[PDB]
Design a protein around this nucleic acid. Structure first.
Lengths: 84, 81, 73, 98, 111, 243, 44
RNA sequence: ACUCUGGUUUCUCUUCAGAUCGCAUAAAUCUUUCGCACUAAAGAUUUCCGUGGAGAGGAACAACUCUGAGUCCAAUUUUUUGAGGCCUUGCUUUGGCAAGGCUA
């Protein structure tokens, strides 16, 4: 009644591998450490692909939640009890 | 609140222009307090692309540029409280 | 909001702000309209499909959605 | 907000003394109102009802927009509609020509 | 038909106070340690009597304490005696202080 | 002694707190004194058997949980603060939990928690916000089940069905406490924050229980706890099928 | 379905044939059901 | 926050019940065991005192408590906007699409 299911699913994703696509077209794939009720994601070991396609490595990343377009979650979360 | 007026307009054939210029022509079925609009029997014409026919559509309330109303709507009795 | 609990589990294509198309299975939604789509694929224009999987998209970029396939078994 | 009172009619005091009273004028005195919206488009019409979000319903409106060729302004007529408030730049009551 | 009763706590308290003369006023079942149903079952099965308890007849005719000849096992010259192995010790641990334990119901341990 | 010698993270669950209420019937302040004394005794033992200080046990750190398994009660300070937050939305339960133990008193006039008791007859934060509500819940259920239980259940937001209110006192208490507290989230919070994962705890395990030492080449791969490495399984128990 | 008046059986017994014989077979039941419903000391 | 079930009590009948069917505890018969069987144990069967479940019928008043079901948010974080306009290339489905460079 207060906090939506997708935010709960994102909470479940902590500790797995996640790929993050911000409005600047930058793709961040790495281990999601923490997440809040907002999409503020603290995520680590980033393989980052820019718009041109350049790939870099960046060990610590904190993304503002307002600036996420979409988040791709691991498929085992499809079996989360919260997705039933 | 004028969204309540929109919610009173169920089952009417209308066209919606979006901020992306997409003109969707269909019959409104449900409206949310946040203007979130669900349409059925929709004819969507995304600009710079040929129109496509579909059964059901839902458009986020943020992404709506404006509304198009027909001629036979007694808006007066509909904007009362 | 029953207008979308009726649409759960249905294979849904959602239109994005940048013109991106996301086809997948509608799982969950919230008040900010963040969508949970499983076994989701993205369609971009040159035709090409990129299989992604479980996508949690923020409500910001979501524009328009439409049923494409009946719920699977 | 310091004023959580249930009997809140300050929104129409905004519609009488605040900036939004300008469009309430066209609601009561029924004059042509010119709208400039975010798509580099202009809207002329008559507003009937709206609220704090400045989303309003108009009737017998002419919208014009220019296309490049080089900019030529086209016009199309719409009988009755409804504009979302946040999709506007400026709102204008048409001037007194007389 | 008078087949079920639902009572309030102020009535149960009054009924409980009135009947105290017939009530043990114990709060535990530790008082019945080695003096309960399982202990008596074991004593009957082992053909022994707990002091202050029932005295049954031998359940089944079998070997006797005077029937086992001296062996190198059970030789009483190899046995250190500090305190006698009372019958209660044989009821408390039926599989340790006893040979051939059958129908031994294990007693409820501490509460 | 055995746990701190085997280099294991130690946490405490003070079970059977209902005995302080239903059996001993101690005043809430003296129940708090009893709990603090138990925690202090555990801390003294740990410091006796261990040199490093990083195993301080205190409910402020989330190390200690309070529970009563018979009545489905299990809470840390954080979980109870979260109950408050779920009831009254605008409070931050993590910062609230940091003021719910020790000689810290609540001042209702200033709505702030101080280290000095406002005036006199002021109770500590733990008594006022945690022990007193639990005392009152148990007292209502076991004394006023017919008189004033439905009203308090309304206050807490628990709605029990009619055939559910007909239960005996012990099942009714279990049910009421289960509704109020819910799942044992405080225990999981404790064990997630203060018990290392196999990946993190692998290094002390190899250091202590492996004959080759952590420095060994196989010791390194074992200390990584990498599931695509060499198989290394250690078995300590043997369970016999009923046959 | 008929509750006889108490003054009927009184006169019947006071004033004293296989119908009569076949009933006496159940006298132990009559004894058992009587001692069972024995008034308690607080009932007059 | 609006509407439709289910009631409870009582009498009788049918079936299942190894469930402390019973928070109590009788009797008979048969077998075995030893004494030498009220003063003794085991196994089995039966009869009694009298139960729960379900189903069925009768008849007495309560009918929506309860169990359910059908029925106040424009100023960063989401839904009251940084939106739209210019240039090149590949293909033009000659409508323009894709990427980049821009101006605001």
């Amino acid at each position: 009644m207060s906090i939506g299911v997708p935010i709960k699913v994102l909470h479940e994703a902590e500790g797995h591998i996640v790929t993050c696509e911000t409005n600047t077209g930058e793709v961040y794939r790495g281990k999601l450490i923490e997440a809040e009720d907002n999409m503020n994601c603290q995520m680590s070991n980033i393989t980052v692909t820019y718009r041109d396609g350049r790939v870099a490595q960046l060990e610590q990343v904190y993304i503002r939640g307002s600036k996420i377009r979409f988040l791709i979650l691991p498929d085992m979360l499809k079996n989360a009890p919260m997705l039933k | 609140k004028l969204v309540r007026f929109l919610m009173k307009l169920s089952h009417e054939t209308v066209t919606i222009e979006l901020k992306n210029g997409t003109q969707v022509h269909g019959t409104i079925t449900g409206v949310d307090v946040s203007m979130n609009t669900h349409l059925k029997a929709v004819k969507m014409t995304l600009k710079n692309r040929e129109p496509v026919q579909l059964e059901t559509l839902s458009i986020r309330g943020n992404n709506i540029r404006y509304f198009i109303l027909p001629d036979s709507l007694p808006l007066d009795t509909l904007l009362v409280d | 909001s029953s207008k979308m609990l009726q649409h759960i589990d249905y294979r849904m294509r959602c239109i994005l702000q940048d013109g991106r198309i996301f086809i997948g299975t509608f799982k969950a939604f919230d008040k900010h309209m963040n969508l949970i789509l499983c076994d989701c694929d993205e369609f971009r224009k040159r035709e090409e499909k990129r299989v992604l999987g479980l996508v949690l998209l923020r409500g910001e970029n979501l524009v328009s959605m439409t049923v494409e396939g009946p719920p699977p078994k | 907000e310091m004023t959580p009172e249930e009997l809140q009619k300050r929104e129409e005091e905004e519609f009488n003394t605040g900036p939004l009273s300008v469009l309430t004028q066209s609601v009561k005195n029924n004059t042509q109102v010119l709208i400039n919206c975010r798509n580099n488009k202009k809207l002329l019409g008559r507003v009937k009802a709206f609220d704090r979000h400045c989303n309003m319903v108009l009737e017998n409106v002419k919208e014009m927009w220019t296309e490049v060729s080089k900019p030529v302004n086209k016009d199309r007529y719409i009988s009755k509609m409804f504009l979302r408030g946040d999709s506007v730049i400026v709102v204008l009551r048409n001037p007194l020509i007389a | 038909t008078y087949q079920r009763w639902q009572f309030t706590l102020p009535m149960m308290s009054t009924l409980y106070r009135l009947a105290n003369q017939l009530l043990t006023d114990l709060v535990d079942d530790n008082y019945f340690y080695l003096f309960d149903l399982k202990a008596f079952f074991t004593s009957k099965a082992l053909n022994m009597a707990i002091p202050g308890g029932p005295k049954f007849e031998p359940l089944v005719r079998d070997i006797n304490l005077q029937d086992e000849d001296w062996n190198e096992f059970n030789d009483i010259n190899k046995i250190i005696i500090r305190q006698p192995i009372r019958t209660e010790y044989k009821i408390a641990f039926p599989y340790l202080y006893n040979n051939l334990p059958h129908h031994v119901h294990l007693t409820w341990y501490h509460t | 002694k055995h746990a701190v010698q085997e280099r294991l993270a130690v946490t405490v669950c003070i079970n059977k707190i209902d005995r302080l209420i239903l059996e001993l019937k101690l005043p809430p302040t003296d129940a708090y004194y009893k709990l603090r004394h138990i925690v202090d005794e555990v801390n003294g033992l740990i410091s006796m058997y261990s040199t490093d200080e990083n195993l301080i046990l205190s409910p402020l750190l989330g190390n200690v949980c309070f529970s009563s398994s018979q009545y489905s009660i299990c809470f840390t300070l954080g979980s109870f603060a979260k109950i408050y937050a779920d009831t009254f939305g605008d409070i931050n339960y993590q910062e609230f939990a940091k003021r719910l133990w020790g000689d810290i008193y609540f001042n209702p006039k200033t709505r702030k928690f101080t280290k000095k008791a406002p005036t006199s007859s002021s109770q500590r934060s733990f008594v006022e916000f945690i022990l007193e509500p639990l005392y009152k819940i148990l007292a209502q259920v076991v004394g006023d089940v017919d008189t004033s239980l439905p009203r308090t259940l309304d206050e807490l937001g628990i709605h029990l069905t009619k055939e559910e209110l007909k239960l005996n006192i012990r099942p009714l208490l279990r049910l009421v406490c289960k509704k109020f507290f819910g799942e044992f989230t405080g225990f999981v919070d404790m064990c997630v924050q203060h018990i290392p994962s196999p990946k993190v705890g692998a290094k002390p395990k190899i250091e202590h229980t492996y004959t080759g030492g952590v420095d060994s080449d196989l010791g390194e791969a074992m200390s990584d706890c990498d599931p695509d490495g060499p198989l290394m399984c250690h078995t300590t128990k043997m369970y016999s099928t009923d046959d | 379905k008929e509750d006889m008046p108490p003054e009927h059986v009184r006169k019947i017994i006071r004033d004293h044939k296989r119908v009569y014989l076949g009933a006496l077979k159940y006298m132990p039941h009559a004894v058992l059901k009587l001692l069972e419903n024995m008034p308690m000391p607080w009932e007059q």
